[PDB]
Amino acid sequence: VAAEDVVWRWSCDNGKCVKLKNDPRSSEPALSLEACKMFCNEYGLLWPRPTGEADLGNFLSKINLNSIEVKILKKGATDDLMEAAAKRFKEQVSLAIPRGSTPKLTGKAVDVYLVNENPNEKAFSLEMDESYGLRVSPSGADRVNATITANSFFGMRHGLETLSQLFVFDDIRDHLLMVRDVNISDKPVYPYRGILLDTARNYYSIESIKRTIEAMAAVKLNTFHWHITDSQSFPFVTTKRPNLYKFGALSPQKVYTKAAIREVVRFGLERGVRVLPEFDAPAHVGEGWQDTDLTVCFKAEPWKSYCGEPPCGQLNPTKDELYQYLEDIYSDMAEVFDTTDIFHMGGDEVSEACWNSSDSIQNFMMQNRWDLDKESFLKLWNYFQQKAQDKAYKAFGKKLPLILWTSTLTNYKHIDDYLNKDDYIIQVWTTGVDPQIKGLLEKGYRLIMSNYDALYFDCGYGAWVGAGNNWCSPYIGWQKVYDNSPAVIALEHRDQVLGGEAALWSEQSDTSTLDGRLWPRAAALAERLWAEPATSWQDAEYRMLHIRERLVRMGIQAESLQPEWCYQNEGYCYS
Amino acid sequence: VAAEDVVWRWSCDNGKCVKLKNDPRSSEPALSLEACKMFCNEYGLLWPRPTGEADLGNFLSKINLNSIEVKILKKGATDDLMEAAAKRFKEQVSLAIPRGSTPKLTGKAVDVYLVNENPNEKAFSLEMDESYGLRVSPSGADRVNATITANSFFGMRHGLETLSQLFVFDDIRDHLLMVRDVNISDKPVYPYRGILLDTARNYYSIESIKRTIEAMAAVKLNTFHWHITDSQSFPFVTTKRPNLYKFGALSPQKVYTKAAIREVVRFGLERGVRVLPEFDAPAHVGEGWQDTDLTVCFKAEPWKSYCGEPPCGQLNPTKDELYQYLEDIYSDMAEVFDTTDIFHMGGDEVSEACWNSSDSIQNFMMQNRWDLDKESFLKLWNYFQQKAQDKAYKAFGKKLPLILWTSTLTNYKHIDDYLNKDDYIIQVWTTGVDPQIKGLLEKGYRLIMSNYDALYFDCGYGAWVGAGNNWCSPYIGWQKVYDNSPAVIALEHRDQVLGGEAALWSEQSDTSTLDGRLWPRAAALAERLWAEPATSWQDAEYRMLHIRERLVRMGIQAESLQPEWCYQNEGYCYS
Ligand SMILES: CC(=O)N[C@H]1/C(=N/OC(=O)Nc2ccccc2)O[C@H](CO)[C@@H](O)[C@@H]1O
Ligand SMILES: CC(=O)N[C@H]1/C(=N/OC(=O)Nc2ccccc2)O[C@H](CO)[C@@H](O)[C@@H]1O
């Protein structure tokens, strides 16, 4: 076969790029699809779109791939991180070029200048500055000046990410192009932009976790919430209490060693991603605890009587030794997850029946004058949480914010009996319309939104117990994730919302299915959290298709949203 | 870290392998999970389970990986295919061994003997013999005799596949094991066991197509139905009418050349998979036909008025030149798809409105005394099909069976006016309970079942036009595909059912998402078609989990069905 050449061209008409034949008898220069898209779309090819200035100009300039140089103007303690970020950037620019295509090495030279105004700052915090400014302009006759200015390394890295998005490959001519005149100013609306990955229901290769982080960085998501343990498995390698992993793991290979974790944590830091660890308690414990006598109900049957899902099992708060185990686990986590400013302690629904089933437990309650009703079991949960919390603080070596899921414990009506708003952040998984949300906000609580009607990425597949479909079906499309707005959910109490997180529970997901589950749906969340657009999904639709293509180019096995024909023929596919 | 060793063992109790600690003070030999499973389960680790004799014995023998030799007893015209099949088999045995694990090179030597009774036979046909017999027994002191006897290469290749499934890796000891005493006899219930892949709505890499075929072969699926063109794109490289692909393709790279197609066809043949091509007509045409004047309504707006989905477009049957184009396309297909015994001609619903919209068309109808009502448009469709059919036969150089989808044309009430049962096979996509099915069967028609309620693999994701979920949602779980029985659907007219096919329409699928869409759900279909079990999904559940793990080992990014904990702890997860 003699491979053909691209035969089509694209022209902007009413905000839509229309495909037209590239006829020879024309004096007007043909535009490639991406080139037309960059100026046809209001925000061009950017995802997420910026919150401030977004001036992309009207032109593109041909660039030579081998002539891109990055210079770091202000040196500091973040030099290593900055140097790493710069290196990644050269590689990102290539992603513009489709695989198997080769650009002509001609054109201008690009100079990228990074101005990090506080070069020593590298800690993750809810108050950290993620803002940046980007300007691109012609410099002299043969080069381009790209200048990124930010208050911190984090803003600077976000700026490099936006800059990488200003490159387009012209497949008609085989030219690498770059936007000529750019003025951009940006910062995120919300500090916490996350993805929860459950690695206990099924194991995820460390390569996959890193790939996930690479994708997150590409859309300015900053938090990876590692739900490391559950009743099904204990893959965290705890040096202090090694039997938990030894007994706990699905296999000896299916484990997360200290070196692997440091590796992931560092990989995250370079990409502005906080790796936040969760040790869920006192429910969701099982495997790895055999022979300790520190749990009750593991594998209790019938399972339905004792828990939400099999296997059943919970910690026994009445055993003093448990707090010793917990201290050790929290300490081992703190050692390796050393960039995190926050610790998640789980707290999803505890089972009354399960606790009531232990005489050892009942005796303890009897001795303490408490009865055996629901109110009393709440007392037991609080007793546990208070003790666990002390251990967590001791482990991290300071008081730090702690996260808990919405639960019976966190009901706004009695939450103050147990928790306080300064010390606890509440992760919300109820529907976006649930009354608990307003009530919690009124009490001053900060929230992370993960409402299941919009943010549960596991939803919609086949049932994993029995037949039918899984519990939270239907499957949530990107359109729905995009339209779910925390600002709408919280109204006037908006500042109290820290952000949001997409949740990938793993009863039905693993190394193999993760790219699909997460991408590009998490990108919808990324834009929503970064920008809080007043606009709807339909306004972001064309760009969403582009970002999906970009994730694929990165090597992500992203879900397919629409026929490629739609991407090539804007406005034709609608409903 | 010092990697641990597996700490658990498994014991059979009431058909379930239960995990127990591998305690040192025991005189009873510990069993690894797969080893326990092989004898605990009624059919062991086999998928699909055999239809005849299935005696697996009670024991396992240690085997040396480097000592497996295959000898072909009867030579013939299929020598090349047999030699290829043998080579693949050595590689398959390794799949038993999990990645990064290394077996001890000790144990017996395995001799595999292949007896192909009709060594010259290599054609695909509905009447072909896929039966085989398998016996395994100890031979002498240091070796194993594995003998496969079949009427044809196809049965022989199915036998090698079953034999590869009789190997287990003992991860407790690092020993490769094989079932010691085996007697198996098998043949499929249905001749046509397929997967439809739509490569026009989105493009699929040829590497992906081959990977799909590898997975199919692993579960004895024998037909790959390539839905090569549609309105969205024309990736088939037709030498005779090169503009269709040149204009038609999503990109110059996104094409299927003759060499690629031969490559896929050959890869299929070696694995007992018929590669069946579909050129859908007269609807579902669009791209690639610009400037021919041979279509009407391409990109007609509003799309809803003229078609099921955008872009709209149909062939104009009144143009004589069209039949010339068609002859050329059919001829180009016949040249490269040279193993197929059947040709699929599409025929999914044609649009009346679209045809009525062309005066050129109306004039033709006016001249032929036909009116402009629905009945008349049916006449036009028949006129087209009759002419297209003649071209198809001329292209293939013989009369061969042709397949059409259920449609207005195929309504059993008037189907005989147009088609005949000898010449046409009807592919059914209505619900399994639709009256058309009984009516068609009563008229003597053969069917391929693809009922959308059970067999549409595209179903359940987000909407691709507008918001919500896609048209045939909910998502179909393996349980549902497994329970859908053609025997039940057809009753006494069972023989008329040729088999079944899972359909992966590609509006929302591509190279990236294909492993997930297809696997392991197609495996459910494979067993149902191969064996027609009276039993339900729950009886096949443990084995299904194993096959999924096997697909992953093969490199398939298969969907995750359940937590791995369930696989390790049978009977604990249920509902
Ligand atoms: C916080 C959370 O989501 N907890 C569990 C969880 N709990 O789900 C419910 O209990 N849903 C529910 C059941 C009855 C009534 C209301 C909600 O869902 C995930 C799967 O989607 C599990 O992986 C989690 O462990
Ligand atoms: C045979 C077939 O399935 N045809 C089209 C097709 N047609 O679907 C329907 O028209 N479904 C339907 C609509 C209204 C009433 C009954 C069925 O579905 C696939 C997507 O699932 C498309 O890719 C196919 O081109």
Annotate A404-458 with three-state secondary structure: EECCCCCCCCCHHHHCCCCCEEEEECCCCCCHHHHHHHHCCCEEEECCHHHHECC
**CA nearest B480: which of B528, B442, B434?**
B528
Query: Is A135 an interface residue toward B (CB < 8 Å)?
Result: no
C-alpha–C-alpha distance, residues B134 and A259, integer Å: 48
Helix B79-94, helix B258-270: angle, nearest 10: 80
Q: State both tokens at B292.
A: 């021919």
Closest CA to B548 of B559, B540, B539, B538: B559
Helix (H, G, I), strand (E, B) or coil at B5: coil
Distances (CA, A) of B273 to B125, B268, B524: 11, 4, 18
- Catalytic (active-site) positions of A: 230, 284, 349
Q: Strand ranges (DSSP E) for B412-514?
A: 424-428, 446-449, 497-504
CA dist., res. A377 & res. A355, Å (int)? 8
Cβ neighbour number for residue B353 with a 10 Å cutoff: 13
> Which two structure tokens, joined as six digits, stand for A361?
């437990």
Amino acid B5 reads: D
Cβ of B308 below 6 Å from ligand 2 = yes
Tokens 């005949």, residue? Answer: B420
State the DSSP string of A139-185: ETTTEEEEEEEESSHHHHHHHHHHHHTTEEEETTTTEEEEESSEEEE
Gap between the Cα atoms of B284 and B546, Å rounded? 39
Q: Which one-letter DSSP state was computed for residue A196?
A: E
- Rounded to 5 degrees, φ, ψ at B223 are -130, 125
Tokens found for residue A37: 């898209």
User: Rounded to an integer, what distance in angstroms lies between the CA atom of residue B63 and that of residue B103?
Assistant: 10
Are the C-beta atoms of residues A570 and A16 closer than 8 Å to each other? Answer: yes
User: Strand, coil or helix: what is A276?
Assistant: strand
Contact: A475, B467; criterion CB under 8 Å: no
Deposited resolution, Å: 2.3
* Contact partners, residue B574, CB within 8 Å, separation at least 6: A310, A465, A466
- Output the six-digit token pair for A83: 């140097």
Ligand 2 geometric centre to CA of B235 (Å): 21
Chain centroid to CA B47: 15
Three-class SS state of A389: helix
Kindly give the number of the ligand 2 atom that is closest to the alpha carbon of B456.
21
The helix or strand, by DSSP H or E, that contains position B216, with its residue range, turns out to be helix B206-218
Which of B339, B209, B227 lies closest to B272, judged by CA? B339
- Chain A residue with CA closest to B8: the answer is A247
Ligand 1 atom at minimum distance from A230 CA: 25
Cα(A205)–Cα(A255) distance, integer angstroms: 9
User: For the packed helices A374-396 and A359-367, what is the interaxial angle rounded to 10 degrees?
Assistant: 90
Q: Residue A201 in contact with residue A309, Cβ under 8 Å?
A: no
User: Both tokens of residue A184?
Assistant: 């951009």
Taking alpha carbons only, the member of B433, B405, B397 closest to residue B344 is B405
Q: Is residue B233 helix, strand or coil? A: coil
Give dist(CA B127, CA B219) in Å, integer: 20
Cβ of B479 within 8 Å of Cβ of A467? The answer is yes
Q: Which residues have C-beta within 8 Å of that of residue B204, sequence separation ≥ 6?
A: B197, B506, B510, B511, B514
β-bridge pairing A143-150 and A108-116: parallel
Element (H, E) at B208: helix B206-218
Q: Is B257 exposed, middle or buried (0-12, 13-18, 19+ CB in 10 A)?
A: middle
Q: Are A43 and A87 in contact (CB under 8 A)?
A: no
Secondary structure letter of residue A462 according to DSSP: B
Q: Buried b / exposed e across B106-122, counting CB within 10 Å, b at 16+?
A: ebbebbbebbbbbbebb
What is the token pair recorded at A515? 């790219």
Ligand 1 atom with minimal separation from the A507 CA: 23
Fold held by A188-575:
TIM Barrel (3.20.20)
Q: Which of A307, A408, A429 to mutate for ligand 1's pocket (most ligand atoms within 8 Å of CB)? A: A429
Which residues on B lie below 8 Å from A564 (Cβ)?
Answer: 202-203, 232-233, 250, 510
A248 touching chain B per CB within 8 A: no
- Whole-number Å distance, alpha carbon A194 to ligand 1 midpoint, is 18
What region, left, alpha or beta, does residue B571 occupy, with left being phi > 0 and alpha being psi -120 to 50 degrees?
left
CB under 8 Å to A134, separation ≥6 — which residues? A146, A147, A148, A149, A159, A162, A163, A182, A183, A184, A185, A186
| CB hemisphere CA count around B179 (13 angstroms) | 28
CB count within 10 Å of CB B266 equals: 15
Beta carbons of B474 and A479 less than 8 Å apart: no
Structure tokens at B175: 């020993």
CA distance A138 to chain B (A): 33
At residue B139, the 3 state secondary structure works out as strand
* Strand extents, DSSP E, A59-151: 60-72, 108-116, 132-139, 143-150
- What is the number of other CB atoms lying within 10 angstroms of the CB of residue B149? 19
**Phi, psi dihedrals of residue A215, rounded to the nearest 5°:** -65, -35
Q: Using CA atoms in the order A407, A412, A415, A421, what is the torsion angle rounded to 10 degrees?
A: 110
Please identify among residues 296-355 of chain A the ones whose CB lies closer than 8 Å to any CB of chain B. 299, 301, 303-304, 310-311
In 10 A of CB B476, how many CB atoms?
25
**Contact status, residue A176 vs residue A109, Cβ threshold 8 Å:** no
Q: How far apart are CA A85 and CA B387, in angstroms?
A: 63
Which ranges of A467-536 would DSSP assign to H, the alpha helix? 478-483, 486-490, 514-518, 521-531
Residue of A nearest to B253 (CA): A3
Query: How distant is the alpha carbon of residue B411 from its chain centre?
Result: 26
The answer to whether B418 faces chain A, any CB pair under 8 Å, is no
Strand A424-428 relative to strand A314-315, pairing: unpaired
The ligand 1 site (C-beta within 6 Å) comprises A 308, 348, 405, 429, 456, 458, 471-472, 505, 507
How far is Cα A155 from Cα A160, in angstroms, rounded to an integer?
9
Give the Å distances, CA to CA, from B229 to A263, A287, B301.
46, 51, 22
Neighbours of B140 (CB within 10 A): 10
Residue (of B572, B570, B552, B571) closest to B560 by Cα position: B552
Sorted by where each begins, the domain ranges of chain B are 1-187, 188-575
DSSP-assigned beta bridge partners for residue B438: none
Q: Is the Cβ–Cβ distance between B217 and B271 less than 8 Å?
A: yes
Cα A536 to Cα B468: distance, rounded to the nearest angstrom = 14
Q: Would the CB of B456 count as within 6 Å of ligand 2?
A: yes
A242/chain B closest Cα distance in angstroms: 10
What is the DSSP code string of A330-359?
HHHHHHHS-S-S-EEEE-PPPPHHHHHT-H
A476: nearest Cα among A461, A488, A460: A460
Q: Do B1 and A478 touch (CB under 8 A)?
A: no
> Of B40, B44, B36, nearest to B182 (Cα)?
B44
Work out whether strand A274-281 and strand A343-346 pair parallel, antiparallel, or are unpaired.
Answer: parallel
Q: Nearest 10 degrees: CA dihedral of B505, B506, B512, B513?
A: -40
Range B1-187 classified under CATH 3.20.20.70: no
Which chain A residues are closer than 8 Å to B506 by Cβ? Answer: 560, 563
Any atom of ligand 2 within 6 Å of the Cβ of B571: no
The position carrying tokens 């059912």 is B497
Six-digit token string for B437: 């099915």
Print burial letters for A292-313: b (CB count within 10 Å at least 16), e (below 16).
Answer: bebbbbbbbeebeebbebbbbb
Closest by alpha carbon to B447, among B459, B466, B434?
B434
Please check whether residue B132 is in contact with residue B148, taking contact to mean a CB–CB distance below 8 angstroms: yes
Assess whether the previous peptide bond of A282 is cis (omega < 30° from 0): yes
- State whether A474 and B476 contact (CB < 8 Å): no
How far apart (Å, rounded) are the C-alpha atoms in residues A70 and A89?
9
Q: What is the token pair recorded at A471?
A: 């519990």
CA distances from A446 to A223, A386, A490, A494, B416 (A): 17, 19, 11, 9, 70
Tally of CA atoms within 13 A in the half-sphere of A474 that contains its CB: 19
Residue B296, SS3 per DSSP? strand
Please tell me what DSSP assigns to residue A525. H
Question: Omega of the bond prior to B520 within 30 degrees of 0, cis?
Answer: yes
Ligand 2 atom closest to B308 (CA): 10
**Which of A228, A231, A351 minimizes the C-alpha distance to A287?**
A231
Q: Are A61 and A108 in contact (CB under 8 A)?
A: yes
